């Protein structure tokens, strides 16, 4: 509880109005970014290798491991430093905005950063508020200003905010005239819809009149002011306490199946490298045991090397082999993966398919690390209201006194009055010319979609709502009468009470209490005799999938109203969980009420929800509907969504079936008995109630041997589609969490549109947040956001399939092309003296991973459609089902490693048998050991590039440019690096090796052959794939 | 609203090849019909090359050169007799081969100072640390420092021909043009300043194992120091432990008489290089070079092996494709 004064004057620890979303400031950039990068296995391993090459004598100069490490670290830091700068700049625009403040009797101008807590802020029209202001005075009468919160919760309605009544007449008239007001607000909460406070104004006398400050008075940060001259407000939360900045989360869902398979591949390649270093070292000392094998009088060890300890020599020899074979771990795999995810993420947002005209918004990506996870989904958990059924409610079949009107002067009027009252529909005040429609432009827009249908349903009959005039309610009663109603009080709907009500003073009569709500909540209040006829009408509508709201009134005498009024205003005064004390202060007010009748509204499905679910099943995904509405209403939609076919047997684990505790024990086991008889599939569907589910998960310690949940999961795992009704948000997470940890890794995707779905969106492997009318809580905490549910078909079948294939082939190709690179360098140790003599020049060791073979794989992973994007969405029956992480399992991994080992052997022994010739030129000249290395390297580069050329099925102009550009760069760079004697370079070992290699015809024929032999199993494989 | 360009919407026009058994089988026949004629040409042209080798390291009592295996006197002169049963038509090349000589050893390969051998005045006075075990001798730098220059091949081979008369006819062996053109004329250069070589090497001595300093290897100034053909050839470190390096070359004569007519020959060896310590072997090779190089059956056999397996497999798949 904080105390705030308007002018910081008589009537401390508050954050400055400066939001920062940047990770790195300026100076901790290098210390923190580098530390985060070197926490990875491969990035740290090349740090150890670089230090080893520096601290001791190693086969290759430290440049061969320092330059590739310095490049990848720089590019990775630049990419991350770029995004962090963009986030900082976006905050800079908000913070470096001029705002007008009434410091002391002056309209002085200060930056939005300088605003403190408890200072008068003047906001002009069409400008976002700099902080959380309490409406204190407005230019126009009634103290009403229209605030558009489209940037916060995606609502373009001009919400009417109300000012403080005691300070209404302060418009441009000494708002600083020692305005005594001590505002006591609660500590900031991310509710964004709940604000509890209490102003304390002091006038000339000793008075302390105080209005309850609610969300109706709070002007949130980052919302655009509309249709108001000017605003006076007091800053309360400024920076990192604003309700705008308290919702900067949604990033704890980051781990992909491909990323953890990289670590599985990286552990193997470390053990392969350990084996090669151990095998060579043990063979080196077997070889050196022969006295003339080492030091055979032509190369003699220096006196320093001869007198050193053998134990240290064995250790340094082992380390020298590690440095020699270190390139078996791809140094550029992290940077290439990160750029592929960063650049390939834009394809989702750029896609014009994920575009909704009504919302004027597309798809937005919050996490690029899960792109490959969209092509691995196995379970889909779907919300009901808003996700599957759009919140467009239609009024059908009103009921009065259980008679289904489709009394005429008494009961008829009250129901329509109760339909035209007891709501907050807030019609569009600026109606157009009356001649456009039957009466005028009467568009109704509000928060709750059910109340919009009821008011429009009355409009079908004579009554019509035209209220909200300075706290007055106007309804046309089938005649020219305006019939004003004074809205004394309003009772806001809450999930606890499951009902809402209003208290209105009749213009020429007594006080009334109109009340709405579900049948299960209002019926205990109403008289028993009226229920017996109304309940059956409710049941038929409820069974047929119509949402029902019962309506009742209550006559209030003036003596009763006065005691209620004193009770209501006293309750609004108190802080410390007002809403719970709200829940009781008027629960007892609405006890004895007279029922009029119920109603029915329709919740129409989305555009292609039946077609989307049909494709999801055809793709092999199990769709579960986790919802928090009634069972029979959700049951009808599932039949509409084709989730349940007619022949399906419904195994209902509802509360009506499970009334006894021990019944659950028997009734849970008979399904296992019943279903296993079918198993000695798509004929059975399961329904779960939240109350039953809580017993299965909590009350499971009683049964140890016959574990309740294990049997329960066995039923669900083999059913068509498990509907789950009346489930609290916590229970939604438990179902998702339960599926994740069983029989391997079933990838789960949860899609929702409200705060009831944030719990399951965060827990699931992939979270999809639909941009619905309920708010932006689901979108903000989601990995990906789509405006409609039918876009899940395009996201999973087209983008998800393509994202997985591109990166599952990129990962396999990095480990393939590096094993081919080192294997000749390992086989050479047998024909050397196990002396750690590199086969290639230090120029080729450095340039191989970053220039020669770095670009063709990057362009592949961004521009490769092995199957066209149009044929992927059109035919979902099989292709999603093909890749259940198949491209990266133990099967295909052994094919790439064995192909690399086969090609690595052909490179060496193809050239080894070629140098038995004693001269490869017509001039009789002989070739050295550096021409041996370049023949092997030239075949190696031409093979790994052409192997990727065979795997491409989509040949854009970029694919030609990088695949044929990397081969053309290798030939040019070899000529350039072998044409001039540099002064700085000391080795000068490659002066003219490449150009002299090409002078001979035999090497031109030898190179061509070795490329074809190496690529033979790849060519042969696709031909066997053409056979059947 | 999102930009409707070809790239952004994943719709760039792409060649997008289609593959069936009907479009890959014809390649197998073509690849199987080009590697067979080439292989036949390569395999045949290899067998036309006439090449002989003479092992003269001794190590056996019957060997004529065994008389100077063990160190007895500094100059050894052992003679080997061999006959040519088939005439060598074109110009003939002379090689010397060594076995178990690990010239690709890590410590051996780096044992050179390529800045010194390029003619750098500063590097000449102080050689690099890579050639350390053979860097300084008697507190003086060694002009060709390193283990590579230290162990240079230094025995003389000579060819003689026996006609009707018992007198031997010496064969003229040419020495120029046995090293790469570029490394002799660009990479390997003498120190810059001076008119005669002996003055350019002032503070530098000869290698420990050598006999004569570097500035008196040859009488011709064009092959005297750091550009001697026999020296430059030895620097090019061999790829494998068993290697052959170009020693001399017998050029073809103007007349119709062949370069080496079929007959008996004598090999005059000035045995100086000791290799029996590390169980090495010394060979002399006379070869005729075709357009592809020396005598190697690998390329010929490999094309027939690759050419036939592509044709044999291509037919069988066509057979399986046809009936099934
Ligand atoms: C040819 O080149 C090889 C390469 O090492 C030499 O072994 C070979 O013999 C060498 O003759 C030179 C004459 O200058 C001597 O320097 C070498 O001797 C050295 O080795 C002896 C071992 O008994 C030691 O007393 C001392 O270190 C000598 O300097 C000698 N090398 C050996 C081991 O025989 C060269 N022959 C020539 C130059 O024709
Ligand atoms: C080398 O030359 C002679 C011929 O003059 C040859 O007969 C003999 O075998 C060899 N030895 C020497 C040096 O005479
Ligand atoms: F109706 Al819901 F999660 F949006 F149960
Ligand atoms: Mg919802």
Author numbering:
A (entry chain A): 19 to 29, 38 to 432, 454 to 727, 744 to 1091
B (entry chain C): 27 to 350
From the paper:
ATP11C is a member of the P4-ATPase flippase family that mediates translocation of phosphatidylserine (PtdSer) across the lipid bilayer. Most P4-ATPases function as a heterodimer consisting of a P4-ATPase as a catalytic subunit and a CDC50 family protein as an accessory subunit.
The structure of ATP11C embedded in DOPS Nanodisc was determined by cryo-EM single-particle analysis. As with the well-studied P2-type ATPases, fluorinated phosphate analogs such as aluminum fluoride (AlF) and beryllium fluoride (BeF) were exploited to stabilize discrete reaction intermediates during the transport cycle. However, to our surprise, structures for the Nanodisc-embedded ATP11C with AlF and BeF appeared to reflect different reaction intermediates from those obtained in the previous detergent-solubilized samples. The cryo-EM structure of ATP11C-Nanodisc with AlF was determined at 3.4 Å resolution. In our previous studies using detergent-purified ATP11C, only the E1P state structure was obtained with AlF alone. The relatively fixed position of the N-domain in Nanodisc may come about through the bilayer interacting with the nearby A-domain, which, in turn, stabilizes the N-domain via the characteristic helix-turn-helix insertion.
